[PDB]
Nucleic acid binder design. Structure first.
Ligand SMILES: [Mg+2]
Ligand SMILES: [Mg+2]
Ligand SMILES: [Mg+2]
Ligand SMILES: [Mg+2]
Ligand SMILES: [Mg+2]
Ligand SMILES: [Mg+2]
Ligand SMILES: [Mg+2]
Ligand SMILES: [Mg+2]
Ligand SMILES: [Mg+2]
Ligand SMILES: [Mg+2]
Ligand SMILES: [Mg+2]
Ligand SMILES: [Mg+2]
Ligand SMILES: [Mg+2]
Ligand SMILES: [Mg+2]
Ligand SMILES: [Mg+2]
Ligand SMILES: [Mg+2]
Ligand SMILES: [Mg+2]
Ligand SMILES: [Mg+2]
Ligand SMILES: [Mg+2]
Ligand SMILES: [Mg+2]
Ligand SMILES: [Mg+2]
Ligand SMILES: [Mg+2]
Ligand SMILES: [Mg+2]
Ligand SMILES: [Mg+2]
Ligand SMILES: [Mg+2]
Ligand SMILES: [Mg+2]
Ligand SMILES: [Mg+2]
Ligand SMILES: [Mg+2]
Ligand SMILES: [Mg+2]
Ligand SMILES: [Mg+2]
Ligand SMILES: [Mg+2]
Ligand SMILES: [Mg+2]
Ligand SMILES: [Mg+2]
Ligand SMILES: [Mg+2]
Ligand SMILES: [Mg+2]
Ligand SMILES: [Zn+2]
Lengths: 50, 105, 86, 134, 122, 59
RNA sequence: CGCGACCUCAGAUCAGACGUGGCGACCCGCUGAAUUUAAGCAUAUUAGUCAGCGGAGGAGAAGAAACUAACCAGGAUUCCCUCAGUAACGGCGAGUGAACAGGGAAGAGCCCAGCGCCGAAUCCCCGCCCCGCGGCGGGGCGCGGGACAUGUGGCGUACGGAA
RNA sequence: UAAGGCUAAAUACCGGCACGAGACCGAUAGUCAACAAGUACCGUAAGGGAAAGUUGAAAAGAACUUUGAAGAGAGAGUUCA
RNA sequence: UACCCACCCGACCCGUCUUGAAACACGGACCAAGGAGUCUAACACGUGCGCGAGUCGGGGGCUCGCACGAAAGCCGCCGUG
RNA sequence: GGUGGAGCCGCCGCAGGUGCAGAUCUUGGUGGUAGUAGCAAAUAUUCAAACGAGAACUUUGAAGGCCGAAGUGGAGAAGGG
RNA sequence: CGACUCUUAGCGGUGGAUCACUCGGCUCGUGCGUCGAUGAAGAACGCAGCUAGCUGCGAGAAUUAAUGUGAAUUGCAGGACACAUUGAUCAUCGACACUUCGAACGCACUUGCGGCCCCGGGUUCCUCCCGGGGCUACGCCUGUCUGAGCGUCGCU
């Protein structure tokens, strides 16, 4: 928006750190069922919850 | 659509019965909840009639139950100042006291 | 032109983030939430969509106080005492 | 037959009491018998296995008679590693192979202040019941 | 070298505040080492110190509130932090004096007509 | 500096002054995306930043 | 044109307390349809039900007769079997539809006001000490307050009671 | 004997804590949910709302040689497979 | 008998509603898994079994923490009904 | 016979959510159509070099061109994040 | 024997049926019957050496002390520890702690403005200014204080 509130900026701060992939050693822990993040977002498709 | 000589059959299921159906699978477990209480109360008041205080002899009201005799609610007051038992004391010696019985005979 | 042409002049927003719900439900013109009902003192639950009711009731959050109230009771609700030292 | 209600005996319930079992419990479960020699001296049938006990493998492909010393305890993998119990990987880099304590016999306990009060109170309990039935 | 709660329990209030401020300093430069490469040895101490600070700060609050609830021990009016916190229902329950209190008409009756012990059919 | 999001410019100045035995001309804050508050701290002309940087271990 | 009682009534960030909200299976007040049935339908029915709203508790409500009965009479309430799909209701049609007695589970009974008697015999909050303090209380001492005579406490309440 | 008041016990519990069981279902079944499920995702919003369990016993998960830009192969090896 | 092929004779595509369907009537690309007369109550008649002018069965009760039991057994309760 | 790697059926009785071709049935899968319709709105590309395993499509140079300052140019709002 | 087509079989794909498992449901019992202005339910934002999600937690933040327990934790590091030590870890949990919203409480929801007290710097209360701590919501009870009334009077 470039004219943001503070609550709005925090919301984007959290959604922008959830985006990264899974650390590759996680795939090594004992009881795993996780391969790819599957909870990623891409600003062109699935716009934010706004 | 009736067919050929049945009854008339007004059955009461029009309202909504499925919701308020009370099943009785407690039935055998309730037999046991009461049994412990019945026992736990007898062991709590150890020397005492487990059945409870003494109730009086009494006749059943309507003409169809004329000839039977019951255990009444409590011994009446008029009864008590004949045997010489104070009304407040009898409550403490296992004598049911009913302050509500008109003696006619 | 009621579609694909009017779906274009849609810049401004009716709802935003409610400070009590957390949902994108707060009506800006009306200044009430509309999922809990914000300036109203009581939450807008309903006996009237049970599926929406079980989406946010006790247990669906953290219970970060209630979850230890069940713990204390289980043991006796005592306080101001410490187990015997070594 | 089990009698005590307040115990489960439910195929899936104490399979669940296993692979969700905390590390504090998993000590008792990862217990292994003692050799006939110790089983005579202490009057203790079995013991939780420890990090540096000596051990003989009894079942499995390479059950044998050589006495190795335990190296670690994968309480998460719920299985122990032993001394020369090991295979060669593809790159020659050797790995240990897990062995279940139930399939292994202890030959020389690693004694301690903690372990000794365990061996006493295990033995004292074993002869208390034999004195109770007597 | 763990700063156990053994040694601190019996120490001076102002003294802990130095050791606390001492760790508070060390934690700040370990956060610096985390940025500038550092070492795997250092990057573990940041978890030790984080915990060892709470090891100290715990003793401060403990000794303080164990002292503060020695002051008001005896006085009728003491603050909301030290009054027993059971349950809003539970603190408004009757007093343990105000349900065993008996009306005087009730006690006079409880004297003349108490419940006997008695068995029968003998 | 990265600095706790609740900090004033006066607060930041009195702490940088308290730790590194330094003195501050003016403080410029921002808030990075990701929400951590950066704070460019301008040191007085008599004070050198290429030196106090070595004390705090950065370079 | 003042000062003083009391009666009304205000203001306090005054001393001390307390109420709101959540849950909502069960529970208690109120509100309250229409699909549906009647082969149409408006009465009826669905149904005092769904939704709405309020309020609780570990259970709630009810409860010590302005009762039942017509008997040689029973004796608070609640629940179960029964009464019985019966007495009655109803475009007497569709359909609706209790109770009493009897058996059993359980079983417990009690307070006021008033009328009177008693020197207000009473209660609250302060201040000092004695004990007790993680369900704040008991014991004593104070011309320390105040409530109360427009009415507090003891006996007493219809089974009779007081003298 | 109304116009005032109190009361345990049997009685009810598709919420909650903690358990026990079954002539029940067995991954299109059983709760929407055996898994990061009231999650992903749709809708401005009220709301709607999924799919998706199984290597082996042990990763011992294919070193090495070789062809290819690489994906993929050919030998080799691991394995009871 | 079943695989392929050959020949002579026969032979229209099933489901359905329908007086009449190969129909210029409708459903049907194909294959997997899922998928439809159920339970409760109330009558009625038929049938089997126990007892028989009687016969129960419920609710209660007496016997357990059930392992099998929330079973089985027993009760002027058995007749209050 | 084969592959498959952990459980299974016969008889006497009991209990069912018990037998599919079909419901423009539900879910999943896959064909024929078919290597087909198509990748045709705003005139336009070409040469050489570089990089590279690989160049009609990148990059640099050169040439031809269009947008033609009511722009395909230079900056903002809301919206996006 | 040309190709195409069809049927069948051998193998190979495509697809995931069947089968065998099951830390999950459903149903029925049993015991208990446990929220909140000392700030709940719920929501937001943070917190791991390498950590996105679930989970666990709250600037003391993948836990704190304490008590049992008694040698691990583990994907890799990395480590303290002396495993003759509260002693690694787990369980319990009764000591302590509880970011921001939220009945939410100084007024407002921008995250903005204030007031009143205190304590640091500033001042030498000199007022700002800067930093830090405690209050400041509505309703209502009992008491307390200050009052108002050509209300009833009394004394004057
Ligand atoms: Mg878009
Ligand atoms: Mg009885
Ligand atoms: Mg009295
Ligand atoms: Mg309420
Ligand atoms: Mg009709
Ligand atoms: Mg009709
Ligand atoms: Mg009609
Ligand atoms: Mg009508
Ligand atoms: Mg009605
Ligand atoms: Mg309702
Ligand atoms: Mg009540
Ligand atoms: Mg009542
Ligand atoms: Mg009655
Ligand atoms: Mg009849
Ligand atoms: Mg009716
Ligand atoms: Mg009086
Ligand atoms: Mg009454
Ligand atoms: Mg599946
Ligand atoms: Mg399957
Ligand atoms: Mg499913
Ligand atoms: Mg599979
Ligand atoms: Mg499968
Ligand atoms: Mg095989
Ligand atoms: Mg025709
Ligand atoms: Mg024709
Ligand atoms: Mg048709
Ligand atoms: Mg297998
Ligand atoms: Mg079945
Ligand atoms: Mg089938
Ligand atoms: Mg032109
Ligand atoms: Mg630009
Ligand atoms: Mg073939
Ligand atoms: Mg095949
Ligand atoms: Mg599938
Ligand atoms: Mg006046
Ligand atoms: Zn809201």
């Amino acid at each position: 928006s470039s004219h943001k509130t503070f609550r709005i900026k925090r919301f984007l701060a959290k959604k922008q750190k959830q985006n990264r992939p899974i650390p590759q050693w996680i795939r090594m822990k004992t009881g795993n069922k996780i391969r790819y993040n599957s909870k990623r977002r891409h600003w062109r498709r699935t716009k934010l919850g706004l | 659509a009736p067919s050929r000589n049945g009854m008339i059959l007004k059955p009461h299921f029009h309202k909504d019965w499925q919701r308020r159906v009370a099943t009785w699978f407690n039935q055998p477990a309730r037999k046991i909840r009461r049994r412990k209480a019945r026992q736990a109360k007898a062991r709590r008041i150890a020397p005492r009639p487990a059945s409870g205080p003494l109730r009086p002899v009494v006749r059943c009201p309507t003409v169809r139950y004329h000839t039977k005799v019951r255990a009444g609610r409590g011994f009446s007051l008029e009864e008590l100042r004949v045997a010489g038992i104070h009304k407040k004391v009898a409550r403490t010696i296992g004598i049911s006291v009913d302050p509500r019985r008109r003696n006619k005979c | 032109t009621k579609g694909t042409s009017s779906f274009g002049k849609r810049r401004n927003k009716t709802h935003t983030l409610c400070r009590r719900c957390g949902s994108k439900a707060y009506h800006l013109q009306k200044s009430t939430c509309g999922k809990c009902g914000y300036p109203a003192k009581r939450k807008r639950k309903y006996n009237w969509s049970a599926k929406a009711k079980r989406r946010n009731t006790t247990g669906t959050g953290r219970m970060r106080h209630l979850k230890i109230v069940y713990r204390r009771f289980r043991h006796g609700f005592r306080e101001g005492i410490t187990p015997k030292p070594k | 037959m089990k009698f005590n209600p307040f115990v489960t005996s439910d195929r899936s319930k104490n399979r669940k009491r296993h692979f969700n079992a905390p590390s504090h419990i998993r000590r008792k479960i990862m217990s292994s018998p003692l050799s006939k020699e110790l089983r005579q001296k202490y009057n203790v049938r079995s013991m939780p296995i420890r990090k540096d006990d000596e051990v003989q493998v009894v079942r499995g492909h390479y059950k044998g008679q050589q006495i190795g010393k335990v190296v670690q305890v994968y309480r998460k993998k719920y299985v122990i590693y032993i001394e020369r119990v090991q295979r060669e990987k593809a790159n020659g880099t050797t790995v240990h192979v897990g062995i279940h304590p139930s399939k292994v016999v202890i030959t020389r306990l690693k004694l301690d202040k903690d372990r000794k009060k365990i061996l006493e109170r295990k033995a004292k309990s074993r002869q208390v019941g034999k004195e109770k039935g007597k | 070298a763990k700063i156990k709660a053994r040694d601190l329990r019996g120490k001076k209030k102002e003294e802990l505040l130095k050791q606390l401020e001492d760790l508070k300093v060390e934690l700040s430069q370990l956060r610096v080492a985390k940025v500038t490469g550092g070492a795997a040895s250092k990057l573990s101490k940041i978890r030790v110190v984080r915990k060892s600070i709470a090891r100290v700060l715990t003793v401060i609050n403990q000794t303080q509130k164990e002292n503060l609830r020695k002051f008001y021990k005896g006085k009728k009016y003491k603050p909301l932090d030290l009054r027993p916190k059971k349950t809003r229902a539970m603190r408004r329950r009757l007093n343990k004096h105000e349900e065993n209190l008996k009306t005087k008409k009730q006690q006079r009756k409880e004297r003349l007509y108490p419940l006997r012990k008695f068995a029968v059919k003998a | 500096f990265i600095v706790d999001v609740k900090a004033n410019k006066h607060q930041i100045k009195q702490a940088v002054k308290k730790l590194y035995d330094i003195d501050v001309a003016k403080v410029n804050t921002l808030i990075r995306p990701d929400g951590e508050k950066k704070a460019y701290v301008r040191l007085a002309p008599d004070y050198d930043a290429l030196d106090v940087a070595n004390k705090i271990g950065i370079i």
